[PDB]
Every structure is written in C-alpha cells, then in structure tokens.
C-alpha cells in the first residue's frame, strides 16, 4: 500500500514560498513513485502563544495559494480548519481536511469536515489516550467521512515537553490509518531538531501509514516553527531513509 | 469579594435551572460576603461519544439563563465554543467562559473580550501555569478588563488529571484565580470523594473563587453525573471554605 | 490526636549544627504541647547526584550525634537507613526508622526495619501510585512493625519535576498514618522555596497526621538541600500556621 | 559488536536455566556477529507483595549461573541489591546489573565498579536521560571501564511506563546504551503485544544492544509471567533486529 508523505511549510507565509516548496515536492513525487505526496500549509495559525506572533494572510489568500500549488504541480492538498464555517470553503481545494490537535474533540468541527466528502486527518490531542481516538473516528464516520487518518504528535509529559508513546501507532491502527507527525512531536510546548530524524526512524520501524513533516527553504527565517521545520534540501534524504527502513521492517508489521 | 460559580453542568431544561437557581439564590442571601454566579452550559461541544447529550441549543439555553437572571437576579456565566457565539451569549452572560481545550484559540478569546463582558479562561490540561500569561495578554489586547484563570487539572499519564497547587500562586501574578472543584478530579476519556478535600486545599493555598457543578440529583444528570455535587451539600461546603479562608487568608503570600 | 512534626537539618553536617537546631526544636516542643516533635537528620546521603557531593561523617558519628540530641533535649529521633545491616545499630537511637523513597520497595530493608521493634516511616517513591503503598504496609506488618507511617514527597511529573497529588493523603490514610514532606515535594530532581508554605497549607487542609520539614540555621550554607531547607527562624511561624489551619479544617476531615 | 542480553527473569531452578541456556547457546552459534549474555536474577528483591516468589538465594543462584557459564561457555549477568553482594556475584557475573530503583545508590555502584567487572545500570523510572551522566561518573570514579546504561521506561502517570526514545541518543554520549524490551512495556504496581514493535524502534533509532527476558513457558513463569518472551520466538526477533539494524545503521547520528 502506498506510503503517505505529507509535507510543506508550516504557514503560508507567501504564495512564492509555497511554489518554491511545491516544486521540490513535485520533483520528489516523480522520484519516489511508491509514495503519495500531499502538500501542506496553514492559511492560519489560530493558536500561537503570543498575540504578537504571525498568524497568516487570511482564508481567502491561503486557499488561492494552495490552489495555485495544486494547479501548477498536480499535488494533492491539505490544510487545517479552526471553526465549522471554514470547512466548506477549504474543501474546495483541500483533498484532506486537517483537524488541529486541540480541537480533536469538537463535535461540530469534525462533523463539518466529514460532510464535505473530503478525507479527514485528525491530529491526536496532547491530552488524549490512544484508545480514546476510537470515538473520534466514530464521530467522523457518523458524519459521513469515508477516508480517515489519525496523527500522532506527542503527549503532554510534565510541563513544556511532549513524549511520543509509540504504543499508540498499533492501537490507533485498529480504527484508522495512522500518520506520524515528525515535526510537532519533538517541539517543546510554550533541544528539538536533532531528535526529528531518530524518532521518524522509530515510527516507520514500528509501522505507520505515512509521515508528516514541515519543511522550509530556510527554517531560520520561517515565520512559525522555525526551530523545528526541516531544511528543504534534507527532505529527499529523510524520505529515502524511511522508505528503506520501512521496507526492511515491513515483513514484521503485526496484523491488526 | 470571594467568588462562587455554581450550577448544573448542562442546561437540561430551564426548569432544572430554576430549581438550582432557587437554592443558589437562597445561599446568595445567606452569604452576603460571597459573589455567587449561576453557571450552566447550553451545549456540551466535546462529549467523547457522538451518541451523548449535548443540549437544546444556544437560543433555548440563553433564554433559560435569562429566566434565572430575571427571576433570581443572579449573575450569569456560560461557555462559548466558536467565535460567533460570543455576542448572543454576552446578552445574558456576565462572565464568558472559555473551555479548557480552546484556551489557546485567539479568535475565540478576542470575540469574548470584544463583548465587553468579564472573561474566565479554563487553563488547558496541556498548559503550564506560567504560560497563562500570554492568554491573559490576548484578552487585554482584545479589550478585556475583568479576567479570570481557572485551575481544572493537568494531564497526568492517560485518563487522569492531577492538580498542581503551585499553579494558584503562579497564575495569580496576572489574573484572578478560580479553582474548578468538579472537573479537577474527573478521569478523562475515585472522583467524587476527592472534591471537598481538594477544595479545602485550594482555599488553604489561596484563590479568588471556587467553581462547582451541582445538581438536585447528580445520579440522573445528563452530563458529568459522576462528579456533580448534590445540591443539598452545597451550603455546607461553602460555609466550610469561608471558615478555612477566614483563617488561612492571614498567610496568603503577597506575590 | 497529637499532630506530628518531624524536623531537623537534612544532613548531620556536625554535632554542633545538630544541638543548635535541637535547641530550637526543644523550645518549640515546650510551646506547642499539642504537637509531638521528632528530630531528624541523616548520617548519610546515600544517593546524591554527584559523586563529589557531601555524603556525611559515617554511621558511627551520626548515631552518636543523634544520641547527644536525644540525651540533651529529650527529643525523639528519626534517621534513614540504606541497607539492611544499618537497621540494628540505628535502632539503638532512632524512635522512628525512615525508609528512603527510592527504597520503599526493597523487601529486606523494610523487614530489617520492622524487626527492630521501632516505628517505621516509608517515604512514598516518586514512581509509586498511592493505592500501591498498601503492599508496602503489608510487608511491614508481616515483618513485625506495629507503628507505620507513609510520607508523601511528590511524584515524577515529566523530567526534573515533582507534582503533589493531594488525593494521595486520603488514599494512603486507609492503611497508615500519613506524613506530608514539605521540603522534598517542591524540589526539582536532578523555583522551589516559595512553594513550601503554600503546599503545606494545602496538606493540613486536606488532612494528614504530621508534616516533615528540613530546617537549618542558615540554609544558604547547608551541605545538602540548601535551596529548600527552611530557615530555622521561620519554623515557629510555619508550625503555628498549620496548627491554626488544621483546627479550622479538622471538623471536615472525612472518616476513612 | 551488538549485544543481546537474554534469559529467564528469575532463577526458578538451575534446570530451567540450562534449558534456556541451551537455546541461547544455539543462537550464539548462529549469530556469530552478536555477543550474547545469559541473564537471570537470583532474587526478586522488590516484588510488590510479601507473598510472592523471590528465589532460592544468592549461593544457589551463583552456582546455577556457574553451571551455565561452564556447560555453555556463555557470558553472564545478574543484578545485585546491596553492596555486600557485588564480590560473590562478580565470581560468575561478567556484567553486574544495577536495578533501576537503585541506580542512584552510590555505595552499590562503587561496590560494583570495585569488582573490576563490567557494569550495566538500569535507568530509573524517575531519572531524566541527561542525568545518567553522573551515574556513569560515579562508576568511573569507582574504577569501572565497561559501562552500560539501559533504557527501561519512564513513569507516565500511575501504573504506566512510556519509552522516550530521545533518551537513546542522549545517554549514548557517555555510555553504551542497551534497550530493555520487556520491562519497558509492563505496567507497574497491553504489555506483550508491544514488545517487538518497540524493539524495532530501538534498533531503528540506534542502540548498542537489546535486553530481553525469555521463558520456555512464560505462562508458568514465577516472575514477570505476562511479559517474558516465549523461548521459541527469540530467534525470529533477533534476526529481525539484525536486519533492521543493518539497514538503519547507515543513519545513526555520530553524536
């Protein structure tokens, strides 16, 4: 089954940044034909810590940029919504509607995403036990979603720290396809980078259906997640490595 | 003065709200020293199961709360779940409540501040005490003047919440602090026996108010049945925390 | 029932330090007659982080100093043991044998303490759930202990941090007398001081049978726990406050 | 070379030790690339219950391990619980194992180093990865030269352990790192189904060896029955981690 790689800059800082990253992703999709790539970027960071941090350029602008990426490269698209009303407009361009970790339990947002007919990817809340994502998936099916993903992005471990409990991959696999978020799982809420690659290797060795990675031409200048966004030039090598580890580990993946 | 926010978890019916409102009114008359605020949610927006009780709607709920504020002259507070609900709710609500999961949603906070009403944010289970500083700033930026931060527990492994009381003095540096006595002991996903003990700790440590869900018959509650306090037990607990506070206040640190 | 106050310098830095603190504790015992005071100090810090930190002056020296305190002031004594063989010699002076948090599950150390006929106080491990102290008490009874205490000293909460779950007081009270350790519960493993008094108020409001506090004439010069040891001149006020909070909260203590 | 430490949890009888030793010997002959070490405890010093199996004593245990080292020529490792046991154990044990709870007991570490043998410390459930640096220093001070740190999980709420794999590269800065595949998934106080998945993660991330308890019939084990790996399953798992390591080693960071 085709492995999923969801990647892109954290925030749609501009339509130019989007096309620049989109070009590299299109190139990788041509090389890694056994992979299904999905371009990701948020039209809005609705929950930055500080009121002074970069949020975005609006839904309208974001959707237009994302659509430009899709038209120009033939890339599938995914972006996250924050309130029910955003589902409809976003569904016009997004192949996969993403649900933020903090909102994984908001019934109406989930129902709004499901009725669009698009695929839905829910980031598992940092407060949520893996066995409790069962009802999240149940809500989505109830709302009409036929293609569902659950994304592992770490769990609250003391203050300002997240730990990844890899037991969650096979548990959530019982009711949905599982994606490992390599970027936000090492982030210190409220170092980090050096742990991205090692945990990604662990994820594919344990077994998942896809990986999610934020990447930017020059992370040091990103308007959000600068410290954890992967340098764009490193994406190819990371992908090649996980496909290699995936292949050799695959014969041992347990049947759920 | 000391704040006591109480009421049934969900607006099961304006009838139930009036029965609880009557008692809160009575206690209100008995403890003139305490500022009571009637609380109840018009919608349980994040029940684990799709097949659970959510409520009767915003309109029916606002109308029911209006009836309590009118019949008993009590202050009101209910929680909002999306930005568009702030204004209609602000018609009745004296204090707008922000759910713990949504404590970081900038637009929800700004829409709350914009109504001019008081705003009470439940500290997320994922949030460090010192990180509530930015939450308060967003509300100030948005024009909020009366701001409350409510302690409701912190994620401790799976399906468990622990109350780190160090948070009370930390959050107090930038806002009035309320202690949520009922959601702080519930396991997410012994509960009741621990509500009063931890309530006593909160007042011994020092807080500006206490938040408690109460129901005539918690057993039959449509939400949080396991943790809602029997209405008949409310007076005794209020008297107990006022006596403890009277003695302990002598030692509350300045900060 | 007489409230227990266990206090003293963390480590027996010298016999002079011991007599100096012992004098203040004797004075307080005369004032607070409704309190049972127990003088505490370790003849050895058997698990400092660094091999270079202060450990002590030996079992022999320590026991002799502790005995001097007992003879000179009529104060009850408590100190901790680290290996089974230490129980016998230590029992000659200690009225209460303390079991370190990390060793709360070592069957032989527990059995060695119990057969001395002395009272035993076990610090609850930072890894231990409160309902699991039941078997610790069972082991002690099996070994002959008739007077047992369980001491709350925090729980592992992420890295380098402890949280106090006050629900543990009424749970452990089901099988033993409970003591709240005001000093080590705010310590950051591997600020702190400002939280000592507030958490002590919480402990007595919830309800316990005693409090444990480390105190030193000049904390800033202590050879161990300098940051969290309470200034000796502050002890009287802390004790007075907890007796006041205890009295007003007492009528509400639940029956276990 | 890669380390594989395996054996039954408790020395239930030198007989059982010989049956397991035979298989480890065979695998030893099959995977010449791997350094096998036979492991078994002569005493379960911290069972929750006083009415549980502890063992048959240090003398009986050392004798039984001696029989394995003699009959099969395999290296040995057992854990000590108090300082006085280091020397007698060092007669047979090639590697002295320090229990996770006692990883901070200076005298136990020093007595272990003094025997001149190799020392493997299980990282406490309460210990941060970076704080293992001082543990290693105590052993060096004590004369230890071959030092191992073993990852066995971290306290995550009550009765639960989580494995933070970030610890593998952190501890590796000052010692060889071993991953304990069996105690890392046990709940203190799904287990088995998670042993192999996490073992795969450990080798994908990078470690110098793996630790696994195995028993001919775990169901009948006198200790850790729920988590000991069936002896017949050991070969397949070893082959699996060698293949994963062969491919993943290309990407292990230098550090």
UniProtKB/Swiss-Prot annotation, chains A, C:
Organism superkingdom: Bacteria
Gene3D superfamilies the UniProt entry points to: Aldolase class I
Catalytic activity: D-arabinose 5-phosphate + phosphoenolpyruvate + H2O = 3-deoxy-alpha-D-manno-2-octulosonate-8-phosphate + phosphate
Entry-linked InterPro entries: Aldolase_TIM, DAHP1/KDSA, KDO8P_synthase
GO MF: 3-deoxy-8-phosphooctulonate synthase activity
Oligomeric form and interacting partners: Oligomer.
The protein's name in its UniProt record: 2-dehydro-3-deoxyphosphooctonate aldolase
From Swiss-Prot, chains B, D:
Main location: cytoplasm
Matching SUPFAM superfamilies: Aldolase
Keywords linked to the UniProt accession: Cytoplasm, Lipopolysaccharide biosynthesis, Transferase
Catalysed reactions, as listed in the record: D-arabinose 5-phosphate + phosphoenolpyruvate + H2O = 3-deoxy-alpha-D-manno-2-octulosonate-8-phosphate + phosphate
Gene3D superfamilies: Aldolase class I (3.20.20.70)
Pathway annotation: Carbohydrate biosynthesis; 3-deoxy-D-manno-octulosonate biosynthesis; 3-deoxy-D-manno-octulosonate from D-ribulose 5-phosphate: step 2/3; Bacterial outer membrane biogenesis; lipopolysaccharide biosynthesis
Subcellular localization: Cytoplasm
Pfam families from the UniProt entry: DAHP_synth_1
EC id: 2.5.1.55
Gene Ontology, cellular component aspect: cytosol
Transmembrane portions of the chain: none
Any one Gene Ontology BP term: monosaccharide biosynthetic process
GO molecular function, one term: 3-deoxy-8-phosphooctulonate synthase activity
Domain of life (superkingdom): Bacteria
HAMAP family the UniProt entry points to: KDO8P_synth
UniProt record similarity statement: Belongs to the KdsA family.
Assembly and interaction partners: Oligomer.
Protein's name according to its UniProt entry: 2-dehydro-3-deoxyphosphooctonate aldolase
Native source species: Aquifex aeolicus (strain VF5)
Underlying gene: kdsA
